[PDB]
Ligand binder design. Structure first.
Ligand SMILES: O=C(O)c1cccnc1C(=O)O
Ligand SMILES: O=C(O)c1cccnc1C(=O)O
Ligand SMILES: O=C(O)c1cccnc1C(=O)O
Ligand SMILES: O=C(O)c1cccnc1C(=O)O
Ligand SMILES: O=C(O)c1cccnc1C(=O)O
Ligand SMILES: O=C(O)c1cccnc1C(=O)O
Lengths: 289, 289, 289, 289, 289, 289
């Protein structure tokens, strides 16, 4: 995509409600440190001290806008961060900058760190000649989904489904509960009348074929070794060429290339959200003359 | 210090609210996946697949209570996870179990992941002879502070001030805006009447002394090499024996012992929250009764 | 669709919150008519005074639950209503029973009113030997969508996309804004990726082909006369067998049979929500043994 | 009355909140369709496609304001709508115009639908030479009451009580629970100390006299056939000239002239909110010259 | 009446919501104090240390119910408090009792203090032979109206009009805005269609008469000396026998009998809410024997 | 203090939330009174009818801002009010001023009442040559703590800790629950890692010392007569120089000077918030073309 146009995804109602809560979480009562700085007009520089990808400007902006501060970016959303970079400047009343400071920073650090891993992982795949979509999961922080999924998009990963209402994903537990894969997929297909796709976690070739026969649009190959994964995917694409194939389970940055192959459409990774460290940013006030 | 007594810190109102919003994030509309599993009474086993410390039972319990499911814990809050362990059992209607599965796991993974890092770091400190307090920061995920600060406790580090509303904290930025460290602290110390303490970030011996003279209860030595840090702290404690010394900036699990000396009372670490990977948990239905 | 299992689609959090907002709407302050009834143990009987389909038990139930009342139903959810029928008995404190009454009845009235129309539309389509799906739209009352979309399902219609983060729908205005049907569907598919279906509104056969060619999952044939619809449908189906066709616009109970064909998969009708008179119900306290 | 000044009744806080819940209902997560339109400065025409009364302007406006879009109206609120008329022009970014489209349309459709049905009933009553008040009920869609009551006022009906903290209304059930009309009215008058009126639903002449005697500000005649209603009213009016008489139950636009008569003061009709079809409108983007 | 049956006025939704804000206000973060008491099953005695009237049981209860505690009342709601009285007893986990303490005490203290003041006023009114209704105002604490108005009622005063939603009160300002008293009342009367009473603030016998002629249901005689009030009110009743006559403005508990007279129906008092000191209660843990 | 620079303490999100709830409480539905005044541009004078200290401008401003109304203050926050003052002017639509009026007046009155009470007290203390802190308590009206604690500051008192997660307070009850003072304070000390202070309620010199020995930062001497208080305090300060001493319990404005001795640091007064009458203010519409 283009990372600058991604911001248009964020609906501005649910956005400001997020921002409000984040501020309240941090300053529920009186802001005593306000008195230290006073409210004089001020400027601070946003320092990027970690390599990766910048993401999260829409969140960073919104937070400060709520506090009557203005942000000037010196890079675009999505651009590569080359450490000790001065990536932006923030102007407003001192106390307002310093109240927004930590929250904006945390939001930007986390969003960026996710985008960073996603870009790293996308590269590694491109590098192995893979043409598919590296994806995320629902293994997001609670109440932080919007920021994390958006982060994955800025990094060039696909978001995967956002909600639980958005694609019907039959998993091991759904199959156990429904008493077998055929039964499960039949129900799943009925519930997704014509508007929603069905995906089915399958731990074996058999489970997959059963799923694919039953009319699954996607078959997720969960926890296969690579040497098992590709022959299994080959059989599937051969027999059901219109069915998409996702590999997930245990997949990391280091090993990702082994999971890439001509018959895998999607690779999903817990790690992009669950084990992607936050980038180091600071926001420092500089004096005017 | 009992880690099972820690759930009492959680006020039940802010807890049940948080849980609602987590579930609403994940499934705002219709849960089509309820139709695949139906609603038969079922049981699921919680499996820990990562080493660390188990943290977040109160949140796990709340999530599932909200969905009319019950939880039996086989290990106490804060115990070591020795992997491929069966840590607990969850009971309830199938569709209800599966609705809360991900959000619960996410929450538990995230909280446990932090506890583990805190525990690692506390152990490191103990191992380097040091009886001070290892601590968190305000570098927490937005909307998720309660879980992360609670996690820090369960792992046995200190939370630090929760929310900018406890302790008053003067930083590089407050000093710049106030036109001096002398001015900044006097203002800070006026604001925090008797109820609140004043801590000051300082980047030199000089700036520390000025702070302590000015009436600082705590003096944070920001971003020192340990070779500078300890001589500095030695003088401070000589000249102002009742002023506490915190050290912060660049402190990893790797180098933490280097910042563990006899005149350092608090060590705060960004990494305990920012860069602690989540633990791997799963929740698998079984068909006993 | 077994209509009694549909209640499993209702996540219990968003439900309970919605119930709260309805009761607060109807009684923001003090309930003065509490004093008129007092709080004597009491029982009322719900009478269905209109013909159609009973829908809304979950909502009815959950309103009374919030006011310590209990409901016992004598008809199953989705059953046929033959007038002057006793469908349930609600038991609880008089004042509570009387507080919930209008809100609970108003909820059951539209939900049933909508289901009734859906059932009638489905019946006319089965009646013209159509094996397709009758569907709702996003033409729903603001804030009431959960009840209305559930209503359609209980009457045997498809809900279409609930959401707008569900299926990606390119409409007449999108096509304009984009700058052409070709350029728009390219951009839709890219946003949709593997996770979502792209549906496109099309005013002619030419626009439909352009669309199918750009990779549309569903072509929606907007405001065609029946004489023009079916030729156009037959063409798309011969040339792109894997694309689903939707007819929509101007469709009524009376004319629906003329829109049924062997090459229409979905027919959506705005009237099913926008013009479905609410059923007559009432709740009258009786005396007990 | 002036229909344009009714907007003053709408307190801008409850209006804005209401709008946000509607917006959030339609797009809880990510707006994928933003990418198809993009953010081009754009303009749309509001086409009125059904006959009736225009109502809902202040809500329509509020919605788009919340998305940074400006509305310009060509008909004033309350004017007669003559089909295929251009009533307004909405401008702003393309993605925003399309985000608010369906919600704003759905709001205006239903408010106008009601206004029309009220105006229609007001007209037939005027046509019978009746000078009383046609009225709404509390039979409103849950959560949508502010819009529906307002629609009644624009069509020139009277909203009954909005609220329930409103007028005190003693109904058949209140009378049953109390054990007797005179008891009930005593209790109701006590609760309505001097600030509220007391109304009593009465199913006979005998009960209506009991209630009038006991001091009710109004007597509602609950299901009378018209041949019975007017003698019962006449007797009431002669015996208690300062009591007001409401006729309710079964009153359709077709039979309304028969319920009009010199001794009825208020005629409340459930149909106005429960069975008023919504109007047809559409919002189509045009390019400028 | 019966102060015990007043609790039925409080709808359980808006209670629990109110109680939740109050608790959140007091402990928005982690409750560190809970670790000092631990969770031992405990009991505590509520001690009334001031003279007055007890009011606020429903709130006190709700608060502790939310914290899983239970309350046994030794005196009924509305009874006379003779100091150092042991009025109730509260049981539940120690940290829960202690978390609820202050918030519940503050609530009961203020409700009780208002009911005391209202009683005092109702007494003096009765003592002076007057059969009217002492009333309060909209001079309530912001967001504490439910409790304050409830207190008035328990004290035996009237809750003058709760919300601005059910009576229509024309004031000095409304008249100025409207450009005269005739105009204002005329307008008000048309706004309050048949459901709502109109009250008019009048500062002179003229302005009162004018309002009465225009159709005012009540005439409020504002800031009159008593020697002016009673002649003014006698003319009023002479000409307008069915128009209620309220007196207001600087009426204190001391002079209240001077404002009592056969022609005054209602007496509102700012002081019942604005200057009613809180009672002194305390909650003391004891060991069981 | 500098009373004008105190507004900076008020975070703008929590402020605008609070203000919305006040407005929603006072007019949840339709504002019939808007029709009486119309929307004409108007102005209103704010009159101060009582002596005291002016407090609550930020809340006042925010309230009106929310209703598109501007305020011009002719007196700085916290100035002395000398009665019949014209302290400010409010411009806006007529219906908007009148909707805001009472809510804002109510806020300003109780904020100003408290500031006044506190100024009275701080004055007597400064008059008694005392250099310590006059403080508040947590005996604040529920849901209104921000306004009341802010008012205390403006009048020159200290807020004290605001909520239960500032300083950690051990009271009679915490001691009972812990089974002793030693145990309770150790637990509070362990809980208050380094971020917080521990304060202990003590009813005797011995208990004060046990607390001081166990590491208490402050010792609150509850309910001592002045004759006991000072000699107790003189001993503490001798034997534990850096422990602070707060007196509290029964300290009226009248007797306060008796509590102002050289070994007392803090004096807390329940009365400042529990028994401080609100000041008298009106807002009157005046003329302009
Ligand atoms: O549920 C998902 O959306 C999902 C998609 C791909 C891989 N894992 C998951 C998961 O959360 O378990
Ligand atoms: O603000 C804090 O509480 C804090 C405390 C210790 C270390 N870092 C921080 C920070 O957020 O920068
Ligand atoms: O958007 C939809 O879901 C939809 C689907 C089919 C027909 N109309 C609509 C509409 O709301 O206009
Ligand atoms: O209650 C009302 O407001 C009302 C007013 C007139 C007629 N019916 C009703 C009703 O809801 O039953
Ligand atoms: O507002 C009221 O209803 C009211 C009623 C009686 C006395 N004062 C008032 C007031 O203006 O606050
Ligand atoms: O608890 C407090 O914060 C407090 C502090 C000082 C004086 N009183 C109190 C109280 O409300 O009991």
């Amino acid at each position: 995509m283009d990372a600058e146009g991604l911001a248009l995804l964020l609906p501005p109602v649910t956005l400001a409600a997020l921002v409000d809560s984040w501020l309240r979480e941090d300053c529920p009562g009186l802001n005593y440190a306000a008195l230290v700085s006073g409210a004089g007009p001020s400027q601070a520089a946003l320092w990027a001290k970690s390599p990766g990808v910048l993401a999260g400007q829409p969140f960073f902006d919104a937070i400060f806008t709520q506090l009557n501060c203005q942000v000037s970016w010196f890079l675009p959303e999505g651009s590569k961060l080359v450490p000790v970079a001065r990536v932006a400047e923030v102007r407003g009343p001192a106390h307002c900058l310093l109240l927004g400071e930590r929250v904006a920073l945390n939001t930007l650090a986390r969003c960026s760190g996710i985008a960073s891993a996603a870009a790293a992982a996308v590269e590694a795949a491109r590098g192995a000649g893979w043409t598919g979509h590296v994806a995320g999961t629902r293994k997001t922080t609670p109440g932080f989904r919007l920021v994390e999924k958006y982060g994955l998009l800025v990094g060039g990963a696909a978001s995967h489904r956002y909600d639980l209402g958005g694609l019907v994903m039959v998993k091991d537990n759904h199959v156990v509960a429904a008493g077998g894969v055929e039964k499960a997929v039949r129900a799943a297909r009925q519930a997704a009348d014509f508007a929603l796709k069905v995906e089915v976690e399958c731990s074996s070739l058999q489970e997959a074929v059963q799923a694919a026969e039953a009319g699954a649009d996607l078959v997720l190959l969960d926890n296969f070794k690579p040497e098992e994964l590709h022959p299994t995917a080959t059989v599937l694409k051969a027999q059901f060429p219109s069915v998409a194939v996702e590999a997930s389970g245990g997949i990391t940055l280091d090993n990702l290339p082994q999971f890439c192959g001509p018959h895998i459409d999607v690779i999903s990774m817990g790690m992009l959200t669950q084990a992607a460290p936050a980038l180091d940013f600071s926001l420092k006030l500089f004096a005017k003359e």
